[PDB]
Protein backbone atom coordinates (compact mmCIF):
# COMPACT_ATOMS: atom_id res chain seq x y z
CA UNK A 1 0.00 0.00 0.00
CA UNK A 2 1.09 3.57 -0.78
CA UNK A 3 -0.15 7.05 -0.22
CA UNK A 4 0.13 10.18 -2.31
CA UNK A 5 0.00 13.54 -0.76
CA UNK A 6 -0.17 16.58 -3.10
CA UNK A 7 -0.67 20.28 -2.67
CA UNK A 8 -0.73 23.38 -4.86
CA UNK A 9 -2.38 26.54 -6.02
CA UNK A 10 -6.15 26.63 -6.53
CA UNK A 11 -8.07 29.40 -8.33
CA UNK A 12 -11.82 29.90 -8.35
CA UNK A 13 -14.10 31.84 -10.62
CA UNK A 14 -17.88 32.15 -10.25
CA UNK A 15 -20.40 32.94 -13.01
CA UNK A 16 -21.58 36.52 -12.34
CA UNK A 17 -18.83 39.15 -11.84
CA UNK A 18 -16.86 37.56 -8.97
CA UNK A 19 -13.32 37.72 -10.34
CA UNK A 20 -10.56 35.17 -9.81
CA UNK A 21 -10.02 34.06 -6.20
CA UNK A 22 -6.80 32.35 -5.19
CA UNK A 23 -6.09 29.65 -2.67
CA UNK A 24 -4.78 26.18 -2.31
CA UNK A 25 -5.79 22.53 -2.53
CA UNK A 26 -4.45 19.41 -0.72
CA UNK A 27 -5.30 15.82 -1.67
CA UNK A 28 -4.56 12.57 0.12
CA UNK A 29 -4.76 9.49 -2.02
CA UNK A 30 -4.43 5.86 -0.98
CA UNK A 31 -3.66 2.87 -3.14
CA UNK A 32 -3.24 -0.83 -2.55
CA UNK A 33 -0.25 -2.52 -4.26
CA UNK A 34 -2.50 -5.03 -5.90
CA UNK A 35 -5.55 -3.23 -7.29
CA UNK A 36 -5.82 -0.21 -9.67
CA UNK A 37 -8.72 1.12 -7.57
CA UNK A 38 -8.11 3.40 -4.61
CA UNK A 39 -9.47 6.46 -2.93
CA UNK A 40 -8.73 10.11 -2.82
CA UNK A 41 -9.84 12.91 -0.55
CA UNK A 42 -9.59 16.60 -1.35
CA UNK A 43 -9.57 19.86 0.55
CA UNK A 44 -9.93 23.16 -1.28
CA UNK A 45 -9.95 26.73 0.02
CA UNK A 46 -10.04 29.96 -1.91
CA UNK A 47 -10.69 33.55 -0.91
CA UNK A 48 -10.59 37.09 -2.15
CA UNK A 49 -11.06 40.38 -0.33
CA UNK A 50 -11.57 43.82 -1.82
CA UNK A 51 -11.74 47.31 -0.31
CA UNK A 52 -13.17 50.09 -2.54
CA UNK A 53 -12.27 53.80 -2.49
CA UNK A 54 -15.77 54.32 -1.07
CA UNK A 55 -14.63 52.29 2.02
CA UNK A 56 -16.83 49.32 1.15
CA UNK A 57 -15.26 45.92 1.77
CA UNK A 58 -16.00 42.45 0.54
CA UNK A 59 -14.56 39.07 1.52
CA UNK A 60 -15.47 35.78 -0.15
CA UNK A 61 -14.28 32.38 1.05
CA UNK A 62 -14.85 29.05 -0.66
CA UNK A 63 -14.24 25.65 0.91
CA UNK A 64 -14.58 22.32 -0.90
CA UNK A 65 -14.41 18.89 0.85
CA UNK A 66 -14.67 16.05 -1.58
CA UNK A 67 -13.73 12.45 -2.02
CA UNK A 68 -14.15 9.63 -4.50
CA UNK A 69 -12.59 6.76 -6.39
CA UNK A 70 -9.11 7.00 -8.04
CA UNK A 71 -8.08 4.64 -10.80
CA UNK A 72 -4.47 3.91 -11.70
CA UNK A 73 -4.27 3.60 -15.52
CA UNK A 74 -0.57 2.75 -15.72
CA UNK A 75 2.66 3.42 -13.85
CA UNK A 76 2.66 7.13 -14.62
CA UNK A 77 -1.03 8.14 -14.84
CA UNK A 78 -4.25 7.92 -12.86
CA UNK A 79 -7.71 9.50 -13.05
CA UNK A 80 -10.22 10.31 -10.28
CA UNK A 81 -13.69 11.67 -9.72
CA UNK A 82 -14.82 13.23 -6.43
CA UNK A 83 -18.08 14.36 -4.79
CA UNK A 84 -18.89 16.15 -1.56
CA UNK A 85 -19.78 19.51 -0.15
CA UNK A 86 -18.89 23.10 -0.94
CA UNK A 87 -19.29 25.96 1.56
CA UNK A 88 -19.32 29.64 0.69
CA UNK A 89 -19.04 32.52 3.23
CA UNK A 90 -19.62 36.00 1.78
CA UNK A 91 -18.96 39.06 3.91
CA UNK A 92 -19.86 42.60 2.96
CA UNK A 93 -19.51 45.89 4.78
CA UNK A 94 -21.13 49.11 3.50
CA UNK A 95 -18.97 51.90 5.01
CA UNK A 96 -18.96 52.98 7.66
CA UNK A 97 -20.50 50.09 9.62
CA UNK A 98 -23.27 48.24 7.75
CA UNK A 99 -22.41 44.52 7.60
CA UNK A 100 -24.25 41.66 5.90
CA UNK A 101 -22.82 38.12 5.96
CA UNK A 102 -24.19 35.12 4.09
CA UNK A 103 -23.05 31.50 4.15
CA UNK A 104 -24.50 28.27 2.94
CA UNK A 105 -23.44 24.78 1.84
CA UNK A 106 -23.98 23.23 -1.58
CA UNK A 107 -23.10 20.10 -3.51
CA UNK A 108 -19.51 19.93 -4.92
CA UNK A 109 -17.98 17.51 -7.47
CA UNK A 110 -14.69 17.32 -9.38
CA UNK A 111 -12.37 15.25 -11.51
CA UNK A 112 -8.67 15.18 -12.10
CA UNK A 113 -5.57 13.43 -13.33
CA UNK A 114 -2.32 12.61 -11.43
CA UNK A 115 0.90 11.88 -13.22
CA UNK A 116 3.99 10.17 -11.70
CA UNK A 117 7.02 11.44 -13.72
CA UNK A 118 9.20 9.46 -11.19
CA UNK A 119 7.76 6.69 -8.88
CA UNK A 120 7.85 8.82 -5.74
CA UNK A 121 6.66 12.14 -7.26
CA UNK A 122 3.16 13.24 -8.27
CA UNK A 123 1.91 16.09 -10.49
CA UNK A 124 -1.81 16.65 -9.81
CA UNK A 125 -4.30 18.60 -11.97
CA UNK A 126 -8.01 18.87 -11.17
CA UNK A 127 -11.18 20.93 -11.52
CA UNK A 128 -13.88 21.32 -8.91
CA UNK A 129 -17.40 22.67 -9.32
CA UNK A 130 -19.86 23.68 -6.63
CA UNK A 131 -23.40 25.17 -6.61
CA UNK A 132 -24.00 27.26 -3.49
CA UNK A 133 -27.51 28.70 -3.51
CA UNK A 134 -27.59 30.09 -7.05
CA UNK A 135 -23.89 30.80 -7.66
CA UNK A 136 -21.79 28.29 -9.57
CA UNK A 137 -18.12 28.28 -8.43
CA UNK A 138 -15.51 26.62 -10.67
CA UNK A 139 -11.96 26.02 -9.35
CA UNK A 140 -8.85 24.85 -11.20
CA UNK A 141 -6.05 23.16 -9.25
CA UNK A 142 -2.43 22.31 -10.05
CA UNK A 143 -0.51 20.51 -7.26
CA UNK A 144 2.62 18.49 -6.65
CA UNK A 145 3.75 16.02 -3.95
CA UNK A 146 5.20 12.65 -3.07
CA UNK A 147 4.00 9.07 -3.26
CA UNK A 148 5.33 6.94 -0.39
C1 LIG B 1 -13.90 11.29 -13.87
C2 LIG B 1 -12.74 10.38 -13.83
C3 LIG B 1 -13.08 8.96 -13.75
C4 LIG B 1 -13.65 8.70 -12.40
C5 LIG B 1 -12.82 7.57 -11.85
C6 LIG B 1 -13.79 6.50 -11.59
C7 LIG B 1 -12.85 5.44 -11.30
C8 LIG B 1 -13.56 4.26 -10.76
O1 LIG B 1 -12.99 2.97 -11.04
C9 LIG B 1 -13.23 2.51 -12.36
C10 LIG B 1 -12.64 1.17 -12.57
O2 LIG B 1 -13.13 0.12 -11.69
C11 LIG B 1 -12.19 -0.38 -10.67
C12 LIG B 1 -11.73 -1.84 -10.49
O3 LIG B 1 -11.70 -2.58 -9.19
C13 LIG B 1 -11.35 -3.93 -9.51
C14 LIG B 1 -9.84 -4.27 -9.58
O4 LIG B 1 -9.30 -5.58 -9.33
C15 LIG B 1 -9.42 -5.98 -7.90
C16 LIG B 1 -8.37 -6.96 -7.25
O5 LIG B 1 -8.52 -8.34 -7.64
Tab-separated table of N, CA and C and ligand atoms in Angstrom:
chain	number	residue	atom	x	y	z
A	1	UNK	N	0.824	-1.226	0.000
A	1	UNK	CA	0.000	0.000	0.000
A	1	UNK	C	0.848	1.262	0.000
A	2	UNK	N	0.354	2.316	-0.697
A	2	UNK	CA	1.088	3.570	-0.781
A	2	UNK	C	0.090	4.698	-0.617
A	3	UNK	N	0.619	5.862	-0.327
A	3	UNK	CA	-0.148	7.048	-0.215
A	3	UNK	C	0.520	8.172	-1.057
A	4	UNK	N	-0.358	9.016	-1.548
A	4	UNK	CA	0.126	10.178	-2.306
A	4	UNK	C	-0.505	11.404	-1.735
A	5	UNK	N	0.396	12.301	-1.315
A	5	UNK	CA	0.002	13.540	-0.765
A	5	UNK	C	0.446	14.709	-1.686
A	6	UNK	N	-0.537	15.486	-2.165
A	6	UNK	CA	-0.174	16.585	-3.099
A	6	UNK	C	-0.761	17.853	-2.547
A	7	UNK	N	-0.182	18.985	-3.005
A	7	UNK	CA	-0.668	20.281	-2.671
A	7	UNK	C	-0.221	21.320	-3.734
A	8	UNK	N	-1.048	22.314	-3.873
A	8	UNK	CA	-0.726	23.378	-4.858
A	8	UNK	C	-1.757	24.463	-4.833
A	9	UNK	N	-1.538	25.384	-5.793
A	9	UNK	CA	-2.382	26.543	-6.018
A	9	UNK	C	-3.746	26.138	-6.558
A	10	UNK	N	-4.799	26.762	-6.073
A	10	UNK	CA	-6.154	26.635	-6.533
A	10	UNK	C	-6.678	28.021	-6.916
A	11	UNK	N	-7.501	28.099	-7.938
A	11	UNK	CA	-8.072	29.396	-8.332
A	11	UNK	C	-9.512	29.219	-8.815
A	12	UNK	N	-10.399	29.934	-8.171
A	12	UNK	CA	-11.817	29.902	-8.353
A	12	UNK	C	-12.291	31.150	-9.160
A	13	UNK	N	-13.405	30.838	-9.824
A	13	UNK	CA	-14.099	31.842	-10.620
A	13	UNK	C	-15.594	31.500	-10.574
A	14	UNK	N	-16.436	32.489	-10.279
A	14	UNK	CA	-17.881	32.146	-10.250
A	14	UNK	C	-18.585	32.805	-11.430
A	15	UNK	N	-19.673	32.200	-11.931
A	15	UNK	CA	-20.396	32.936	-13.009
A	15	UNK	C	-20.807	34.239	-12.335
A	16	UNK	N	-21.220	35.267	-13.063
A	16	UNK	CA	-21.579	36.517	-12.336
A	16	UNK	C	-20.229	37.168	-11.980
A	17	UNK	N	-20.100	38.481	-12.094
A	17	UNK	CA	-18.832	39.146	-11.836
A	17	UNK	C	-18.259	38.990	-10.431
A	18	UNK	N	-17.537	37.913	-10.221
A	18	UNK	CA	-16.858	37.561	-8.966
A	18	UNK	C	-15.483	37.053	-9.417
A	19	UNK	N	-14.611	38.034	-9.717
A	19	UNK	CA	-13.323	37.724	-10.337
A	19	UNK	C	-12.577	36.583	-9.663
A	20	UNK	N	-11.460	36.209	-10.257
A	20	UNK	CA	-10.558	35.171	-9.809
A	20	UNK	C	-10.335	35.317	-8.297
A	21	UNK	N	-10.217	34.192	-7.647
A	21	UNK	CA	-10.025	34.060	-6.195
A	21	UNK	C	-9.058	32.926	-5.929
A	22	UNK	N	-7.908	33.268	-5.367
A	22	UNK	CA	-6.804	32.353	-5.185
A	22	UNK	C	-6.790	31.611	-3.873
A	23	UNK	N	-6.133	30.446	-3.895
A	23	UNK	CA	-6.086	29.651	-2.669
A	23	UNK	C	-5.125	28.477	-2.836
A	24	UNK	N	-5.622	27.326	-2.285
A	24	UNK	CA	-4.779	26.183	-2.314
A	24	UNK	C	-5.712	24.923	-2.289
A	25	UNK	N	-5.104	23.815	-2.561
A	25	UNK	CA	-5.785	22.533	-2.535
A	25	UNK	C	-4.799	21.530	-1.949
A	26	UNK	N	-5.261	20.521	-1.233
A	26	UNK	CA	-4.452	19.407	-0.716
A	26	UNK	C	-5.250	18.102	-1.066
A	27	UNK	N	-4.628	17.092	-1.446
A	27	UNK	CA	-5.299	15.821	-1.673
A	27	UNK	C	-4.421	14.777	-0.997
A	28	UNK	N	-5.145	13.796	-0.451
A	28	UNK	CA	-4.560	12.574	0.118
A	28	UNK	C	-5.203	11.407	-0.596
A	29	UNK	N	-4.306	10.634	-1.238
A	29	UNK	CA	-4.763	9.491	-2.022
A	29	UNK	C	-4.156	8.260	-1.368
A	30	UNK	N	-4.875	7.164	-1.432
A	30	UNK	CA	-4.427	5.857	-0.982
A	30	UNK	C	-4.604	4.778	-2.042
A	31	UNK	N	-3.574	3.936	-2.180
A	31	UNK	CA	-3.662	2.868	-3.141
A	31	UNK	C	-3.251	1.567	-2.485
A	32	UNK	N	-3.706	0.459	-3.000
A	32	UNK	CA	-3.243	-0.831	-2.554
A	32	UNK	C	-2.216	-1.257	-3.614
A	33	UNK	N	-1.268	-2.129	-3.267
A	33	UNK	CA	-0.253	-2.524	-4.260
A	33	UNK	C	-0.802	-3.418	-5.327
A	34	UNK	N	-1.908	-4.140	-4.954
A	34	UNK	CA	-2.504	-5.025	-5.904
A	34	UNK	C	-3.927	-4.788	-6.336
A	35	UNK	N	-4.281	-3.537	-6.606
A	35	UNK	CA	-5.552	-3.226	-7.291
A	35	UNK	C	-5.351	-1.829	-7.905
A	36	UNK	N	-5.932	-1.523	-9.049
A	36	UNK	CA	-5.818	-0.206	-9.673
A	36	UNK	C	-6.775	0.755	-9.006
A	37	UNK	N	-7.715	0.260	-8.163
A	37	UNK	CA	-8.715	1.115	-7.567
A	37	UNK	C	-8.335	1.551	-6.131
A	38	UNK	N	-8.429	2.848	-5.912
A	38	UNK	CA	-8.111	3.401	-4.615
A	38	UNK	C	-9.052	4.544	-4.339
A	39	UNK	N	-8.625	5.321	-3.380
A	39	UNK	CA	-9.473	6.460	-2.926
A	39	UNK	C	-8.704	7.751	-2.771
A	40	UNK	N	-9.425	8.818	-2.923
A	40	UNK	CA	-8.726	10.112	-2.823
A	40	UNK	C	-9.650	11.086	-2.149
A	41	UNK	N	-9.087	11.850	-1.225
A	41	UNK	CA	-9.844	12.905	-0.551
A	41	UNK	C	-9.191	14.270	-0.842
A	42	UNK	N	-10.027	15.292	-0.869
A	42	UNK	CA	-9.586	16.596	-1.346
A	42	UNK	C	-10.161	17.744	-0.489
A	43	UNK	N	-9.230	18.632	-0.178
A	43	UNK	CA	-9.565	19.856	0.552
A	43	UNK	C	-9.157	21.087	-0.253
A	44	UNK	N	-10.154	21.936	-0.529
A	44	UNK	CA	-9.926	23.159	-1.284
A	44	UNK	C	-10.405	24.409	-0.503
A	45	UNK	N	-9.611	25.419	-0.636
A	45	UNK	CA	-9.947	26.727	0.021
A	45	UNK	C	-9.453	27.855	-0.875
A	46	UNK	N	-10.382	28.758	-1.195
A	46	UNK	CA	-10.044	29.959	-1.913
A	46	UNK	C	-10.714	31.188	-1.188
A	47	UNK	N	-10.117	32.322	-1.504
A	47	UNK	CA	-10.690	33.550	-0.912
A	47	UNK	C	-10.229	34.771	-1.694
A	48	UNK	N	-11.004	35.840	-1.525
A	48	UNK	CA	-10.591	37.095	-2.154
A	48	UNK	C	-11.220	38.230	-1.282
A	49	UNK	N	-10.444	39.254	-1.095
A	49	UNK	CA	-11.064	40.375	-0.330
A	49	UNK	C	-10.779	41.638	-1.135
A	50	UNK	N	-11.684	42.602	-1.008
A	50	UNK	CA	-11.567	43.824	-1.816
A	50	UNK	C	-12.073	45.020	-1.046
A	51	UNK	N	-11.270	46.091	-0.990
A	51	UNK	CA	-11.738	47.310	-0.307
A	51	UNK	C	-11.800	48.442	-1.347
A	52	UNK	N	-12.971	49.007	-1.589
A	52	UNK	CA	-13.167	50.093	-2.541
A	52	UNK	C	-12.748	51.446	-1.987
A	53	UNK	N	-12.654	52.445	-2.880
A	53	UNK	CA	-12.275	53.804	-2.492
A	53	UNK	C	-13.364	54.418	-1.622
A	54	UNK	N	-14.614	53.998	-1.872
A	54	UNK	CA	-15.772	54.323	-1.071
A	54	UNK	C	-15.658	53.781	0.363
A	55	UNK	N	-14.777	52.833	0.669
A	55	UNK	CA	-14.633	52.293	2.024
A	55	UNK	C	-15.294	50.916	2.155
A	56	UNK	N	-16.153	50.605	1.186
A	56	UNK	CA	-16.835	49.320	1.153
A	56	UNK	C	-15.778	48.216	1.101
A	57	UNK	N	-16.161	47.062	1.640
A	57	UNK	CA	-15.258	45.924	1.770
A	57	UNK	C	-16.054	44.646	1.563
A	58	UNK	N	-15.404	43.733	0.858
A	58	UNK	CA	-16.001	42.453	0.541
A	58	UNK	C	-14.945	41.378	0.833
A	59	UNK	N	-15.431	40.231	1.278
A	59	UNK	CA	-14.555	39.072	1.521
A	59	UNK	C	-15.388	37.835	1.180
A	60	UNK	N	-14.849	37.005	0.280
A	60	UNK	CA	-15.465	35.775	-0.153
A	60	UNK	C	-14.509	34.608	0.145
A	61	UNK	N	-15.065	33.566	0.693
A	61	UNK	CA	-14.277	32.377	1.046
A	61	UNK	C	-15.043	31.189	0.460
A	62	UNK	N	-14.257	30.274	-0.119
A	62	UNK	CA	-14.848	29.055	-0.663
A	62	UNK	C	-14.071	27.855	-0.107
A	63	UNK	N	-14.819	26.858	0.379
A	63	UNK	CA	-14.243	25.653	0.915
A	63	UNK	C	-14.842	24.456	0.133
A	64	UNK	N	-13.979	23.534	-0.291
A	64	UNK	CA	-14.580	22.324	-0.897
A	64	UNK	C	-13.983	21.053	-0.270
A	65	UNK	N	-14.801	20.145	0.233
A	65	UNK	CA	-14.413	18.887	0.846
A	65	UNK	C	-15.049	17.755	0.063
A	66	UNK	N	-14.183	17.070	-0.683
A	66	UNK	CA	-14.668	16.045	-1.582
A	66	UNK	C	-13.860	14.781	-1.488
A	67	UNK	N	-14.425	13.705	-1.976
A	67	UNK	CA	-13.727	12.446	-2.019
A	67	UNK	C	-14.364	11.516	-3.036
A	68	UNK	N	-13.599	10.520	-3.467
A	68	UNK	CA	-14.149	9.628	-4.500
A	68	UNK	C	-13.116	8.595	-4.888
A	69	UNK	N	-13.441	7.827	-5.935
A	69	UNK	CA	-12.593	6.759	-6.391
A	69	UNK	C	-11.389	7.280	-7.231
A	70	UNK	N	-10.274	6.618	-7.167
A	70	UNK	CA	-9.113	6.999	-8.037
A	70	UNK	C	-8.697	5.704	-8.717
A	71	UNK	N	-8.450	5.860	-10.022
A	71	UNK	CA	-8.076	4.644	-10.795
A	71	UNK	C	-6.692	4.849	-11.417
A	72	UNK	N	-5.824	3.893	-11.158
A	72	UNK	CA	-4.472	3.913	-11.696
A	72	UNK	C	-4.523	3.245	-13.087
A	73	UNK	N	-4.244	4.050	-14.099
A	73	UNK	CA	-4.271	3.598	-15.521
A	73	UNK	C	-3.001	2.841	-15.824
A	74	UNK	N	-1.845	3.401	-15.489
A	74	UNK	CA	-0.565	2.746	-15.724
A	74	UNK	C	0.391	3.253	-14.686
A	75	UNK	N	1.685	2.940	-14.788
A	75	UNK	CA	2.662	3.416	-13.855
A	75	UNK	C	2.815	4.912	-13.734
A	76	UNK	N	2.447	5.703	-14.762
A	76	UNK	CA	2.660	7.133	-14.623
A	76	UNK	C	1.390	7.959	-14.658
A	77	UNK	N	0.181	7.376	-14.681
A	77	UNK	CA	-1.027	8.141	-14.844
A	77	UNK	C	-2.200	7.445	-14.090
A	78	UNK	N	-3.026	8.327	-13.525
A	78	UNK	CA	-4.250	7.919	-12.865
A	78	UNK	C	-5.313	8.997	-13.044
A	79	UNK	N	-6.574	8.601	-12.904
A	79	UNK	CA	-7.708	9.497	-13.055
A	79	UNK	C	-8.582	9.360	-11.804
A	80	UNK	N	-9.328	10.411	-11.437
A	80	UNK	CA	-10.221	10.308	-10.278
A	80	UNK	C	-11.419	11.221	-10.445
A	81	UNK	N	-12.452	10.860	-9.719
A	81	UNK	CA	-13.692	11.673	-9.716
A	81	UNK	C	-14.035	11.856	-8.233
A	82	UNK	N	-14.479	12.997	-7.849
A	82	UNK	CA	-14.822	13.230	-6.429
A	82	UNK	C	-16.167	13.926	-6.287
A	83	UNK	N	-16.806	13.768	-5.121
A	83	UNK	CA	-18.079	14.362	-4.789
A	83	UNK	C	-18.021	14.784	-3.291
A	84	UNK	N	-18.836	15.726	-2.939
A	84	UNK	CA	-18.893	16.155	-1.555
A	84	UNK	C	-19.639	17.464	-1.424
A	85	UNK	N	-19.121	18.259	-0.502
A	85	UNK	CA	-19.782	19.507	-0.152
A	85	UNK	C	-18.911	20.725	-0.383
A	86	UNK	N	-19.548	21.829	-0.728
A	86	UNK	CA	-18.886	23.098	-0.937
A	86	UNK	C	-19.604	24.091	0.073
A	87	UNK	N	-18.757	24.951	0.545
A	87	UNK	CA	-19.286	25.957	1.556
A	87	UNK	C	-18.858	27.327	1.110
A	88	UNK	N	-19.800	28.313	1.119
A	88	UNK	CA	-19.321	29.644	0.693
A	88	UNK	C	-19.714	30.618	1.867
A	89	UNK	N	-18.799	31.502	2.191
A	89	UNK	CA	-19.038	32.517	3.234
A	89	UNK	C	-18.709	33.871	2.594
A	90	UNK	N	-19.758	34.703	2.463
A	90	UNK	CA	-19.620	36.002	1.780
A	90	UNK	C	-19.907	37.157	2.746
A	91	UNK	N	-18.880	37.940	2.991
A	91	UNK	CA	-18.955	39.057	3.913
A	91	UNK	C	-18.968	40.405	3.230
A	92	UNK	N	-19.872	41.311	3.621
A	92	UNK	CA	-19.862	42.599	2.959
A	92	UNK	C	-20.071	43.712	4.001
A	93	UNK	N	-19.304	44.784	3.861
A	93	UNK	CA	-19.505	45.894	4.777
A	93	UNK	C	-19.701	47.189	3.978
A	94	UNK	N	-20.866	47.818	4.128
A	94	UNK	CA	-21.130	49.112	3.498
A	94	UNK	C	-20.632	50.199	4.457
A	95	UNK	N	-19.544	50.871	4.166
A	95	UNK	CA	-18.965	51.902	5.014
A	95	UNK	C	-20.048	52.887	5.464
A	96	UNK	N	-19.982	53.326	6.709
A	96	UNK	CA	-18.955	52.981	7.664
A	96	UNK	C	-19.125	51.662	8.393
A	97	UNK	N	-20.359	51.305	8.805
A	97	UNK	CA	-20.504	50.093	9.618
A	97	UNK	C	-21.579	49.123	9.234
A	98	UNK	N	-22.206	49.196	8.068
A	98	UNK	CA	-23.270	48.244	7.754
A	98	UNK	C	-22.760	46.897	7.237
A	99	UNK	N	-22.866	45.845	8.038
A	99	UNK	CA	-22.414	44.521	7.605
A	99	UNK	C	-23.557	43.621	7.208
A	100	UNK	N	-23.303	42.682	6.273
A	100	UNK	CA	-24.247	41.656	5.904
A	100	UNK	C	-23.352	40.438	5.431
A	101	UNK	N	-23.550	39.332	6.151
A	101	UNK	CA	-22.816	38.118	5.965
A	101	UNK	C	-23.708	37.011	5.426
A	102	UNK	N	-23.250	36.192	4.471
A	102	UNK	CA	-24.193	35.124	4.090
A	102	UNK	C	-23.276	33.879	3.920
A	103	UNK	N	-23.822	32.740	4.281
A	103	UNK	CA	-23.052	31.498	4.151
A	103	UNK	C	-24.045	30.379	3.924
A	104	UNK	N	-23.547	29.318	3.148
A	104	UNK	CA	-24.497	28.267	2.945
A	104	UNK	C	-23.609	27.090	2.242
A	105	UNK	N	-24.121	25.947	2.411
A	105	UNK	CA	-23.438	24.778	1.841
A	105	UNK	C	-24.114	24.443	0.522
A	106	UNK	N	-23.360	23.629	-0.260
A	106	UNK	CA	-23.976	23.232	-1.582
A	106	UNK	C	-23.238	21.927	-1.988
A	107	UNK	N	-23.734	21.310	-3.031
A	107	UNK	CA	-23.100	20.101	-3.510
A	107	UNK	C	-21.807	20.469	-4.280
A	108	UNK	N	-20.747	19.630	-4.161
A	108	UNK	CA	-19.512	19.927	-4.915
A	108	UNK	C	-19.031	18.635	-5.637
A	109	UNK	N	-18.398	18.781	-6.779
A	109	UNK	CA	-17.984	17.513	-7.474
A	109	UNK	C	-16.752	17.874	-8.277
A	110	UNK	N	-15.924	16.879	-8.660
A	110	UNK	CA	-14.688	17.318	-9.375
A	110	UNK	C	-14.069	16.098	-10.035
A	111	UNK	N	-13.043	16.391	-10.842
A	111	UNK	CA	-12.373	15.254	-11.511
A	111	UNK	C	-10.968	15.677	-11.792
A	112	UNK	N	-10.041	14.700	-11.826
A	112	UNK	CA	-8.671	15.184	-12.104
A	112	UNK	C	-7.830	14.029	-12.587
A	113	UNK	N	-6.577	14.372	-12.887
A	113	UNK	CA	-5.567	13.431	-13.331
A	113	UNK	C	-4.321	13.627	-12.438
A	114	UNK	N	-3.580	12.576	-12.202
A	114	UNK	CA	-2.325	12.610	-11.427
A	114	UNK	C	-1.292	11.863	-12.221
A	115	UNK	N	-0.150	12.560	-12.455
A	115	UNK	CA	0.903	11.876	-13.216
A	115	UNK	C	2.109	11.572	-12.217
A	116	UNK	N	2.792	10.481	-12.500
A	116	UNK	CA	3.987	10.173	-11.705
A	116	UNK	C	5.201	10.203	-12.693
A	117	UNK	N	5.890	11.317	-12.772
A	117	UNK	CA	7.022	11.437	-13.723
A	117	UNK	C	8.162	10.609	-13.188
A	118	UNK	N	8.230	10.341	-11.884
A	118	UNK	CA	9.196	9.463	-11.192
A	118	UNK	C	8.344	8.670	-10.205
A	119	UNK	N	8.661	7.472	-9.750
A	119	UNK	CA	7.757	6.687	-8.884
A	119	UNK	C	7.345	7.289	-7.568
A	120	UNK	N	8.122	8.224	-7.030
A	120	UNK	CA	7.848	8.819	-5.738
A	120	UNK	C	7.359	10.248	-5.854
A	121	UNK	N	7.126	10.772	-7.054
A	121	UNK	CA	6.658	12.141	-7.257
A	121	UNK	C	5.293	12.189	-7.963
A	122	UNK	N	4.459	13.142	-7.617
A	122	UNK	CA	3.161	13.236	-8.269
A	122	UNK	C	2.918	14.668	-8.757
A	123	UNK	N	2.301	14.781	-9.929
A	123	UNK	CA	1.907	16.089	-10.490
A	123	UNK	C	0.363	15.959	-10.555
A	124	UNK	N	-0.359	16.837	-9.925
A	124	UNK	CA	-1.813	16.653	-9.812
A	124	UNK	C	-2.535	17.795	-10.482
A	125	UNK	N	-3.555	17.513	-11.287
A	125	UNK	CA	-4.302	18.600	-11.974
A	125	UNK	C	-5.775	18.286	-11.821
A	126	UNK	N	-6.588	19.159	-11.268
A	126	UNK	CA	-8.009	18.869	-11.166
A	126	UNK	C	-8.879	20.092	-11.290
A	127	UNK	N	-10.203	19.839	-11.439
A	127	UNK	CA	-11.185	20.935	-11.519
A	127	UNK	C	-12.241	20.568	-10.509
A	128	UNK	N	-12.832	21.573	-9.902
A	128	UNK	CA	-13.878	21.318	-8.910
A	128	UNK	C	-14.992	22.308	-9.236
A	129	UNK	N	-16.212	21.854	-9.054
A	129	UNK	CA	-17.397	22.671	-9.324
A	129	UNK	C	-18.374	22.583	-8.173
A	130	UNK	N	-18.879	23.709	-7.693
A	130	UNK	CA	-19.856	23.685	-6.634
A	130	UNK	C	-21.063	24.616	-6.966
A	131	UNK	N	-22.217	24.273	-6.420
A	131	UNK	CA	-23.397	25.168	-6.610
A	131	UNK	C	-23.850	25.556	-5.193
A	132	UNK	N	-23.613	26.798	-4.810
A	132	UNK	CA	-23.999	27.256	-3.486
A	132	UNK	C	-25.106	28.316	-3.695
A	133	UNK	N	-26.302	27.884	-3.282
A	133	UNK	CA	-27.506	28.703	-3.512
A	133	UNK	C	-27.637	28.849	-5.036
A	134	UNK	N	-27.455	30.050	-5.578
A	134	UNK	CA	-27.590	30.091	-7.051
A	134	UNK	C	-26.264	30.280	-7.769
A	135	UNK	N	-25.190	30.574	-7.026
A	135	UNK	CA	-23.891	30.795	-7.663
A	135	UNK	C	-23.129	29.502	-7.928
A	136	UNK	N	-22.564	29.430	-9.132
A	136	UNK	CA	-21.790	28.293	-9.574
A	136	UNK	C	-20.295	28.648	-9.480
A	137	UNK	N	-19.572	27.938	-8.602
A	137	UNK	CA	-18.122	28.282	-8.431
A	137	UNK	C	-17.263	27.227	-9.131
A	138	UNK	N	-16.373	27.634	-10.058
A	138	UNK	CA	-15.512	26.619	-10.672
A	138	UNK	C	-14.079	26.886	-10.199
A	139	UNK	N	-13.338	25.836	-9.857
A	139	UNK	CA	-11.960	26.022	-9.349
A	139	UNK	C	-10.951	25.121	-10.030
A	140	UNK	N	-9.884	25.684	-10.554
A	140	UNK	CA	-8.853	24.852	-11.203
A	140	UNK	C	-7.728	24.697	-10.160
A	141	UNK	N	-7.104	23.544	-10.202
A	141	UNK	CA	-6.046	23.162	-9.254
A	141	UNK	C	-4.867	22.553	-9.942
A	142	UNK	N	-3.666	22.957	-9.514
A	142	UNK	CA	-2.430	22.306	-10.052
A	142	UNK	C	-1.549	22.038	-8.811
A	143	UNK	N	-1.306	20.789	-8.490
A	143	UNK	CA	-0.512	20.514	-7.261
A	143	UNK	C	0.628	19.602	-7.535
A	144	UNK	N	1.494	19.356	-6.552
A	144	UNK	CA	2.616	18.491	-6.648
A	144	UNK	C	2.843	17.800	-5.234
A	145	UNK	N	3.511	16.671	-5.273
A	145	UNK	CA	3.752	16.025	-3.945
A	145	UNK	C	4.493	14.731	-4.151
A	146	UNK	N	4.532	13.917	-3.072
A	146	UNK	CA	5.196	12.653	-3.073
A	146	UNK	C	4.234	11.466	-2.880
A	147	UNK	N	4.636	10.352	-3.401
A	147	UNK	CA	3.999	9.065	-3.262
A	147	UNK	C	5.036	8.273	-2.366
A	148	UNK	N	4.480	7.674	-1.318
A	148	UNK	CA	5.335	6.941	-0.390
A	148	UNK	C	4.608	5.765	0.259
B	1	LIG	C1	-13.900	11.292	-13.868
B	1	LIG	C2	-12.737	10.375	-13.834
B	1	LIG	C3	-13.078	8.960	-13.751
B	1	LIG	C4	-13.647	8.700	-12.398
B	1	LIG	C5	-12.825	7.571	-11.853
B	1	LIG	C6	-13.790	6.497	-11.586
B	1	LIG	C7	-12.846	5.443	-11.300
B	1	LIG	C8	-13.563	4.255	-10.759
B	1	LIG	O1	-12.989	2.968	-11.044
B	1	LIG	C9	-13.230	2.509	-12.360
B	1	LIG	C10	-12.638	1.168	-12.570
B	1	LIG	O2	-13.131	0.125	-11.689
B	1	LIG	C11	-12.195	-0.382	-10.668
B	1	LIG	C12	-11.729	-1.842	-10.486
B	1	LIG	O3	-11.702	-2.583	-9.188
B	1	LIG	C13	-11.350	-3.926	-9.513
B	1	LIG	C14	-9.844	-4.269	-9.578
B	1	LIG	O4	-9.300	-5.583	-9.326
B	1	LIG	C15	-9.420	-5.976	-7.901
B	1	LIG	C16	-8.365	-6.958	-7.254
B	1	LIG	O5	-8.515	-8.335	-7.635
